[PDB]
Amino acid sequence: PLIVPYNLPLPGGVVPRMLITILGTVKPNANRIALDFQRGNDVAFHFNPRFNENNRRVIVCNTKLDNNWGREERQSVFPFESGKPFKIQVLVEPDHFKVAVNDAHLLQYNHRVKKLNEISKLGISGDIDLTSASYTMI
Numbered sequence: 407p408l409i410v411p412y413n414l415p416l417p418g419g420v421v422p423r424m425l426i427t428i429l430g431t432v433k434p435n436a437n438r439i440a441l442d443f444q445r446g447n448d449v450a451f452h453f454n455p456r457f458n459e460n461n462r463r464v465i466v467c468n469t470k471l472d473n474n475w476g477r478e479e480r481q482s483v484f485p486f487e488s489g490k491p492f493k494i495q496v497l498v499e500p501d502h503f504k505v506a507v508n509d510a511h512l513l514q515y516n517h518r519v520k521k522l523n524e525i526s527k528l529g530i531s532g533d534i535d536l537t538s539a540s541y542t543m544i
């Protein structure tokens with residue numbers, strides 16, 4: 407297992423056809439999970455499953471620029487379950503990040519940060535046991 411929060415370097419940032427794969431298991435009675443694709447202090451793509459926001463489960467996505475969160479993009483399709491193993495795949499496409507969970511398409515997030523090759527770290531945090539975090543060029 408990996409220690410959470412975990413930092414995965416993305417050498418030379420991201421680029422279309424780069425696939426990032428996160429394997430782990432959600433803890434019992436989880437509250438949150440977060441992926442933070444960072445460009446220095448900015449967060450190009452924040453992917454944040456919330457297990458209890460007003461007794462609803464929702465995935466919140468956003469970008470943080472100069473310490474300011476922008477407009478949230480919310481997804482009520484929620485494939486995670488407390489206690490269960492998951493796979494998150496984030497595929498960088500030309501106009502968006504494409505996210506699949508457990509081999510099922512979940513959402514896309516249009517690029518707000520344009521300098522893809524400066525998005526050089528992925529932070530993985532929250533109520534999970536982390537098994538692996540890696541990338542491959544497809």
Ligand SMILES: OC[C@H]1O[C@@H](O[C@H]2[C@H](O)[C@@H](O)[C@H](O)O[C@@H]2CO)[C@H](O)[C@@H](O)[C@H]1O
Pocket residue numbers: 452454466467468475476478
């Ligand atoms: O936008 C992602 C960002 O949200 C923060 O929580 C928001 C919350 O979603 C919103 O409903 C409320 O109005 O303000 C909060 C703070 O901006 C999180 O704290 C942060 O971790 C990110 O997930």
